[PDB]
Amino acid sequence: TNLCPFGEVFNATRFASVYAWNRKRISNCVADYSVLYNSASFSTFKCYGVSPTKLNDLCFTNVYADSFVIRGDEVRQIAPGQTGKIADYNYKLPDDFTGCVIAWNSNNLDSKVGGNYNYLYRLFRKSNLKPFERDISTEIYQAGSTPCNGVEGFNCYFPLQSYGFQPTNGVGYQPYRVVVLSFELLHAPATVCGPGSHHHH
C-alpha cells in the first residue's frame, strides 16, 4: 500500500563517490517506475532484460539501488561488458545484468567555481572488480617493478584521484549522478511489484 522510497535515492542531498558507491535495499513495497521514466531530466535511462513497455507491471524478489558520481564521458561505462577506469576499478555490472541505469547531469550541484574535489574514483588497481565489487582500500599502489614500502620507493602511488568538477567544464567532464537499480530474481516471494502486477491489479 506504500510506494518504494525512490525519493531517498534519486533526490538525496549528497551522493557517494564512484569508488564508495552506495547501496540501498528496496523491499516489500510497490515500485512505481513511471515516477522515474516519465520524468524529464534523465539523460540516461536504459534497461536490460525487461519487456519494452511493461516495466511498471513486473515483480522481483528484491531490488538494489546503487548510486554514485562519475563524469559525463564515463556514463557509457555504467553498462554490462565495458572496460575503463570506472567499469574496471570502481563499479562493474555483470554481463547478465537485469536492471536499469539512470543518469543525469548534475553540473548545477556538484561543481563549484574554484573546483569541487571531494568526489573520488579509483585510478589504480592490480586487477578488475568482480560484478558489484566495492573496493575502499587505500593501500599504496605499486606501479613499476620496484616493491613499495608504502610511498617509500619510485612509482608508489596513493590509488584514488579526485574528480575536478568546475561548472565551466566541457560536457564529458561535468558531474553526472547515477542510480543503478538491480533486479534480483530468486525462487522466493516477490517483494517488489509494480502497480500493474497481478499482485496489485
Swiss-Prot record:
Changing N169T: In strain: 19B/501T. Residues 123-158 are annotated as: Disordered. Changing D73N: In strain: Omicron/BA.2, Omicron/BA.2.12.1, Omicron/BA.2.75, Omicron/BA.4, Omicron/BA.5, Omicron/BQ.1.1, Omicron/XBB.1.5, Omicron/EG.5.1; complete loss of interaction with host integrins. Changing N11Q: Reduced viral infectivity. Residues 71-73 are annotated as: Integrin-binding motif. Residues 116-124 are annotated as: Immunodominant HLA epitope recognized by the CD8+. Changing E152Q: In strain: Kappa/B.1.617.1. Residues 105-176 are annotated as: Receptor-binding motif. Changing Q161Y: Reduced host ACE2-binding affinity in vitro. Attaches the virion to the cell membrane by interacting with host receptor, initiating the infection. The major receptor is host ACE2. When S2/S2' has been cleaved, binding to the receptor triggers direct fusion at the cell membrane. When S2/S2' has not been cleaved, binding to the receptor results in internalization of the virus by endocytosis using host TFRC and GRM2 and leading to fusion of the virion membrane with the host endosomal membrane. Alternatively, may use NRP1/NRP2 and integrin as entry receptors. This is Spike protein S1. It comes from Severe acute respiratory syndrome coronavirus 2. The lineage of its organism: Viruses, Riboviria, Orthornavirae, Pisuviricota, Pisoniviricetes. The chain holds residues 333 to 527 of 1273 of the full protein.
